[PDB]
Design a protein around this ligand. Structure first.
Ligand SMILES: Cc1nc(-c2ccc(OCCCCCN3CCN(c4ccnc(N)c4)C3=O)cc2)no1
Ligand SMILES: Cc1nc(-c2ccc(OCCCCCN3CCN(c4ccnc(N)c4)C3=O)cc2)no1
Lengths: 193, 297, 245, 245, 297, 49
């Protein structure tokens, strides 16, 4: 497991550590959206921070099931529940919580065990998948992850109102890669002197 | 527990392919046997019914009087390896001195066999094909002359950085393959595996690759499966300065270890475009020749 | 024995008196996927009745100046029944098909059709007629629906390939003196064990008259053509929200 | 061991840390119908994944002046998924249910709910208040949907029966000091082996706070209540066109 | 052929009811055993958790010091036959001389037990019931006087012609049953089977009987299952002319061979209507009594 | 917090099927990942510079 940059909005060199974690705060309780990201490792996105997404640059095709583990850096006296979902290919981005639910989903209660594992199984017409990008190579898109509120973020007097969640992307034992190549990121401008 | 009966007698969960037929050997044509005259009722091989959509079964023995003939004519040259494993032209890459195509000493070619119709019309008899290959590269100036020049080739798979110049950093070829070769040397020649994610190269895809509201400005992606775009083939004259000599590079493909599926008809109209079966409509020539009278040659 | 036939799958049933034998496309029957060939891990669903039954599409007409038609499968059933309302939910699809065609006529009529099944029947435009103008076929000619689409240049099947060689595929004829229907069974034809049902279109049915319809006045001119078909061994996988297209 | 629990059916999955044991309504598990009890001859369909999974309905709010709610099953799922799009096609229906309820809170909050399952919970109006005026309950109070309906007179459950005796049914509580959820499993409760899914409504879930929510300022006031549920052992029969109602 | 594995290991087709529990005999109450004092940790029967929704299990032995007691108190009078097989009033039929209800010497009564609340509140403890029965008919003038008059009864099942008069043709009773009886004789009395299409009489139906756009003018069919309307019960004074005597007829039901299901709560508000659980809203009396102070009797 | 990776799998989270995977792991080795030539140096021997 290696940390995943879901919060890849900032750019300036002071707030780069903010990429590592996304918050969760207290809300009304309507079942509202928090974050989204794709399940495409080799594609530009959150997955480039990983050692998995950098070893799929030296290999074209991939396979197997993936796993995304989350962790909660909030206070012990806090509570909440969340609805993690995996929306397979074809389907558009869900607009509400009652639409992402119809796919592969997990529900997690904040507690002693400060983590949960979402599992992204292997759903494909093909045995292998070359990497994806905008064009006709979206034939090999993996899907989407779409996090939602199930009840609320509840907390008593004295504790902070906002918390942070950290994510951790990795693979399972049926992952494979083949057809080695050279990556796009060549870290050199001129001559290394 | 499967305690009901409609679950026990169910046909669900049948990973077996019920095959009516079964292959047989045939290293030679069939030996014609002897026959004699017959003057019986009922027995009548000539009268068929073709509405069923099956071919005839009448033979020389059951229509006329034949003799015994021990046929030793082989059927080995009609196989697929003996029919496809014959090299042919699939591409051309020009590296001229001063022009408009590729004057800066480099060129990218999108790997696609469908540009010359002697080899395209052989494969377009079938739909799905699974084959290794053996490319071969013939370099020469336009006059055919042979010159002392060094050359580099580099297989650029999908998702890899395409070079944009002759002095680029994509030419270090640490992980990609490459072939240095001269023109004074013989042709270069290498082998290729089956590189697809799928289980076969389909020369015909009836569908769109992506989801969406298919508007008219995105109809150019009809007939495009990315499980056949096996990448790009780059080439350049090695150096820091431009070359003294023009060049042309011709690419030949030879297929081996072949398996094919799905026979289907054969082209009769001239080809126009790639990845696209279009034909000229105002110039529909017949499948073949013509004459003046059905009652006369 | 070879003329009379019956076809019972699902709640439904078909009879016919003047028919011919049944064809099995490319010499084998449908099947469910093996655990070796398959790649996806999710457990499919296999309804076995609500989807594997005879659906009836639309009823054409056969004049004397008719040219032909085609239908793309399985596009025809993406808005019809518990079949279609599963194919929108899920993403992956696998099936076979039985295909039955009707056209009746008396013993004074004459004609012949050709009922063929071609996998991966891409459609090609005319390139403006001159040849240079690159074009592409619109969405209503590649997925025309259950209402079918009519050919313009049937000698080349609108793809640069003759109809003279369409018999190498699974074919049947409807010679109105002899028979009145054509039954064709087809397995799942694709390089991949599962594939979508909305984007991809695995094969196309064609119906082209070779010898034209003809009769004499005082006789019934309306000679319809009806198309019936049934899924078989249908699987689905990848559940999520419904996608029209 | 008794606190932590997990519930995996279908593509979906539920976790929980501060829970209690699981209840089986009326002491037995769901089942498919026997060939002896059954009467219809048609072969059902049994998808086993596309229908038997967790659906999430709607998220209420629990103020201090709240009174209660109810939901009718299986009306809640007649417009949701391949479940609902089978229940419109077919006419006959059979199923069980697992029912999971959520309400979280900190260790400074206090309250208690009652999560009960009552078969054949007819609704009764107030007879105009005077008693003489005969009335009847409208359609949006007997099949209110997935958005639920709120009670007006919870001491009598709007049917002349006390709530003090609702524990004789399959019940659980959510005391916010102890637990944060309630899991209830229910078989198919009816005199007939199959019955419709649109007209008939076999039982009703109730959620009534007994001890009211309370807290102190500076603490989070929004205390939602979410309702999750899963069909099990679902059968269908009598195929035909789709019927909304 | 079921060659896949997910079909072999499948739980589909399970006609068995997994029952956690199992019935046991109990002809007498439980015999209290002896106990003594205990001063241990861990063991703690008093502390329960009721959030689970199960009842307690603490007993006299494990909370205090008891003695041995050999209980012989039977549990036979709490059964259902010994609780339900006790006749009660279910109907009344008036045949007066001159009035407005039924002056022409005939009367139709719709068979429905739900009109008197001593017997309705016993059955409304349960939801589904399967029982035979034994009706009994008591005829008398309003004064209780007994008169020499002949009477006819006729069970009119569903779908049969209801009589519209005293001199009608539906009284031939060729296929329907009937009971001639006098008032000078004892009460009439007959037995009844379980007559439903279903497998139980449900006193509570949550649904509508028919399909359609349920408008407000057709909400009077909420809570109506026709698998309980077991028909009609007709009665008349035999003759061609009117009678000399008024009459009243009272109907008593006695249930036997009973089976019940689904315990549920009990009515606490007064009944108003039939087939309808409605209550008065401005007059919600509590379930029971009341007092002035929780700290005082 | 322990600093070990997860152990949950497809079988123990959802409903799966049997799948007989034959996908090799031979091309992720080190020889099959490193034994591919690349540029490491340049040496110039010009006329006048
Ligand atoms: C060092 C070095 N290596 C190499 C080197 C270069 C290229 C190689 O790939 C050769 C693969 C041949 C691919 C052949 N197919 C299959 C399908 N298909 C198309 C194309 C367009 N339309 C359709 N409908 C189908 C097509 O064209 C391998 C090796 N040479 O230099
Ligand atoms: C000669 C002759 N034969 C007879 C003779 C007369 C009548 C007989 O049927 C007695 C059947 C008793 C039926 C009892 N139930 C079952 C359900 N139910 C209701 C009613 C209203 N609402 C609800 N929700 C339920 C009800 O009322 C049999 C015999 N007497 O004269």
């Amino acid at each position: 497991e290696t940390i995943l940059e879901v919060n890849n909005v900032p750019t300036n060199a002071t707030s780069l550590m903010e990429r590592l974690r996304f918050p969760v705060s207290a809300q009304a309780g309507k079942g509202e959206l928090c974050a989204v990201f794709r399940a495409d490792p080799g594609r530009n996105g959150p997955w480039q921070s990983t050692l998995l997404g950098q070893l799929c640059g030296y290999y074209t095709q991939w396979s197997g099931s993936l796993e995304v583990t989350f962790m909660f850096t909030g206070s012990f006296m806090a509570t909440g529940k969340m609805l993690i979902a995996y929306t397979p290919p074809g389907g558009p981005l869900p607009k509400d919580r009652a639409t992402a639910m119809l796919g592969t989903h997990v529900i997690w209660d904040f507690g002693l065990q400060s983590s949960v594992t979402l599992v992204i199984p292997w759903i494909s017409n093909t045995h292998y998948r070359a990497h994806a990008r905008d064009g006709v190579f979206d034939y090999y898109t993996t899907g989407l992850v779409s996090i939602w509120y199930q009840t609320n973020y509840v907390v008593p007097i004295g504790a902070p109102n906002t918390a942070y969640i950290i994510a951790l992307a990795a693979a399972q034992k049926n992952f494979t890669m083949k057809l080695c190549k050279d990556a796009s990121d060549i870290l050199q401008t001129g001559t290394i002197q | 527990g499967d305690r009901v009966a409609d679950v026990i007698e169910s046909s669900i969960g049948d990973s077996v392919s019920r095959a009516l037929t079964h292959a047989l050997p045939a290293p030679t044509g069939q030996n014609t046997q002897v026959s004699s005259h017959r003057l019986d009722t009922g027995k009548v091989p000539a009268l068929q019914a073709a509405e069923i959509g099956a071919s005839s079964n009448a033979s020389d023995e059951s229509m006329i009087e034949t003799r015994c003939v021990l046929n030793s004519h082989s059927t080995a040259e009609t196989t697929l390896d003996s029919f496809f494993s014959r090299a042919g032209l699939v591409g051309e890459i020009d590296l001229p001195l001063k022009g408009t195509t590729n004057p800066n000493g480099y060129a990218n070619w999108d790997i696609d066999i469908t540009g010359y119709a002697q080899m395209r019309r052989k494969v377009e008899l079938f739909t799905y094909m699974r084959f290794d290959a053996e490319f071969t590269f013939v370099a020469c100036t336009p006059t055919g002359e042979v010159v002392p020049q060094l050359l580099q080739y580099m297989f650029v798979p999908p998702g890899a950085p395409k070079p944009d110049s002759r002095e680029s950093l994509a030419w270090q070829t640490a992980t990609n393959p490459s072939v240095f070769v001269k023109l004074s040397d013989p042709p270069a020649q290498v082998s290729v595996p089956f590189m697809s994610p799928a289980s076969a190269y389909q020369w015909f895809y009836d569908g769109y690759p992506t989801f969406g509201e298919h508007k008219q400005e995105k109809d150019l992606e009809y007939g495009a499966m990315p499980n056949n775009m096996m990448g790009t083939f780059s080439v350049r004259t090695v150096g820091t300065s431009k070359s003294k000599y023009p060049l042309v590079v011709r690419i030949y493909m030879r297929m081996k270890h072949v398996r094919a599926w799905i026979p289907r008809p054969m082209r009769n109209q001239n080809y126009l475009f790639k990845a696209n079966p279009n034909y000229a409509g105002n110039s529909i020539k017949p499948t073949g020749a013509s004459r003046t009278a059905i009652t006369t040659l | 024995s070879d003329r009379v036939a019956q076809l019972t799958i699902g709640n439904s049933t078909i009879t016919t008196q003047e028919a011919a034998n049944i064809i099995v496309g490319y010499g084998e029957w449908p099947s469910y996927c093996s655990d070796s060939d398959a790649t996806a891990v999710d457990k499919p669903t296999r309804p076995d009745v609500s989807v594997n039954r005879f659906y009836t599409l639309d009823t054409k007409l056969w004049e004397k100046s008719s040219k032909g038609w085609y239908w793309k499968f399985p596009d025809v059933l993406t808005e019809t029944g518990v079949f279609g309302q599963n194919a929108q939910f899920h993403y992956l699809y696998r099936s076979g098909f039985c295909i039955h065609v009707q056209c009746n006529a008396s013993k004074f009529h004459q004609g012949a059709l050709l009922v063929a099944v071609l996998p991966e029947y891409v459609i090609g435009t005319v390139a403006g007629g001159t040849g240079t103008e690159d074009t592409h076929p619109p969405y209503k000619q590649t997925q025309p629906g259950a209402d079918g689409f009519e050919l313009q240049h049937p000698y080349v099947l609108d793809a640069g390939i003759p109809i003279s060689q369409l018999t190498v595929c699974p074919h049947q004829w409807i010679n109105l003196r002899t028979n009145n229907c054509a039954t064709i069974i087809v397995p799942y034809i694709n390089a991949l064990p599962f594939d979508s049902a909305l984007n991809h279109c695995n094969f196309g049915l064609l119906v082209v008259p070779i010898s034209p319809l003809d009769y004499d006045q005082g006789a019934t001119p309306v000679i319809p053509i009806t198309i019936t078909l049934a899924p078989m061994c249908s699987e689905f996988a990848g559940l999520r929200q419904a996608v029209t297209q």
